RNA sequence: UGACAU
């Protein structure tokens with residue numbers, strides 16, 4: 001049964017703009033990161049939000065958001081997108097990739113307006129934004145409303161675990177910007193509720209994830225859909241912190257004469273995260289987690305685990321200890337997942353146990369410690385995980401449990417990530 | 431394994 005109607009998004013102005021992490025002590029160190037731009041005829045980067053040829057109201061929304069100065073990815077992607085070019089954007093976690101695409105797209109939607117089309121119940125969005133998880137899609141949706149606040153733009157969302165008709169009937173009214181998880185998006189496409197015949201911008205957030213074996217078929221069904229306008233007559237944008245060369249190659253099928261902007265080393269960890277490791281047997285992990293939480297009372301802690309099974313187990317373990325713990329993973333009801341995330345953000349619960357479902361994109365204020373109870377199999381997922389802390393120039397801590405019986409294969413990539421980020425390398429990862 | 435329509 002899927003009947004959950006999520007609460008309606010706040011139309012409280014202050015609350016819409018307060019959905020942000022305030023910049024931290026090292027925000028100005030973003031100026032010291034080497035920017036590599038490759039591709040034909042890159043337009044010059046902009047120097048400030050004031051000198052970015054943005055519309056008065058769009059600029060005023062950026063300033064309402066709290067932002068005073070663009071990050072490196074924004075300095076580059078903004079003029080690139082407004083020139084009409086395709087873009088692969090790589091930049092570390094917590095450095096403002098979302099606004100890098102929202103702000104200019106919102107600008108061009110307003111500056112170069114087209115009348116909406118919704119014909120025969122079938123909406124034709126001018127922007128499709130896809131992301132690999134439901135809570136990230138909702139987050140992106142709320143950021144789009146922030147930067148498009150007070151304008152005539154209509155943003156809609158589409159993701160699973162919600163009542164299909166609630167989202168469907170809303171989309172049917174028409175929307176400029178549709179933000180979606182792929183499953184629910186294709187559902188509406190195959191029902192003739194959404195069509196790609198008016199698309200001006202496609203955006204893959206976490207694009208390296210979207211292009212891997214798990215999502216590539218769903219990406220093809222969008223990019224190559226019969227209703228989709230061809231690559232030469234629309235813009236495609238792809239952002240991530242991580243981007244293996246083999247995945248970069250696959251991206252080029254959907255890109256037209258594109259610019260590749262990489263801020264710092266591709267796939268590098270944020271240097272604002274202190275990365276610590278504890279060597280432990282599979283048995284010892286439980287005791288070591290308890291110990292780490294005991295040594296950190298009053299801190300907001302995000303605990304990553306491999307299985308949904310272990311997520312449920314760890315939440316139970318910590319809860320029976322009398323610690324207020326939320327859990328988020330794919331076997332939980334959608335309502336519960338959104339409530340766990342909200343309880344964790346609000347501070348009601350200081351501990352959140354998560355599978356990889358929360359590894360990418362989520363922007364949670366004041367995560368003090370990210371704990372990898374289980375390390376992931378991919379270094380790129382590790383980079384994203386620890387990036388849940390240390391954002392926008394604030395400093396954070398990651399503590400990862402290393403078990404050689406499980407994680408030996410990761411050691412060479414960990415060590416490289418550590419050295420790139422100026423982190424000490426324990427003897428057991430050498 | 432883990433995300434991703436019902």
Ligand SMILES: Nc1ncnc2c1ncn2[C@@H]1O[C@H](COP(=O)(O)OP(=O)(O)O)[C@@H](O)[C@H]1O
Pocket residue numbers: 019020021022023066067068069070071074091092093094095096097098099361362363391392
């Ligand atoms: N130019 C800026 N100045 C201050 N804060 C910003 C700026 N750009 C983005 N932010 C904030 O930084 C946080 C991280 O943004 P996000 O787009 O999630 O980063 P990324 O996608 O690179 O991980 C968000 O809370 C966002 O509101």
Ligand SMILES: [Mg+2]
Pocket residue numbers: 097098205206361
């Ligand atoms: Mg992001």
